[PDB]
């Protein structure tokens, strides 16, 4: 029998003695946004080195 599936949001709780303090962020690799890359280059008049 295909019963419908009523899902509340359920608002997951704790109490104060069971609140875990925090977990420190220790750093992984150095958070780069840019990196180098080889590209070709073209002298003035347009042609290539």
């Amino acid at each position: 029998k295909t019963i419908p599936t009523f899902e509340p949001k359920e608002s997951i709780l704790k109490k104060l003695e069971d609140i875990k303090p925090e977990q420190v962020k220790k750093q992984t690799k150095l958070f780069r946004i840019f990196e180098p890359r080889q590209l070709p280059v073209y002298r003035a008049n347009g042609e290539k080195e």
Partner: protein, 72 residues
């Protein structure tokens, strides 16, 4: 009352129809009397299967509200 007559009852629809002409409470215990004469006919001792299947017929639908069930 049409079902009542269709089942084969003649005098007792007549008592319930001629009572409504006045709707008095002095003749009304008759109704109560009738309401007790129905349950002194016996039990409808049917089968376990079909008696469960009187209850175990379900019509569950994806057209109801959600505003209702959450408040419920």
């Amino acid at each position: 009352l049409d079902n009542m007559r269709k089942a084969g009852l003649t005098d007792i629809p007549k008592m319930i129809q001629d009572w409504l002409v006045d709707c008095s409470i002095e003749k009304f215990p008759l109704m109560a009397k009738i309401y007790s004469w129905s349950f002194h006919v016996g039990f409808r001792k049917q089968k376990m299967l079909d008696a469960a299947l009187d209850q175990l017929k379900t019509e569950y639908t994806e057209d109801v509200d959600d505003e209702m069930y959450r408040e419920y």
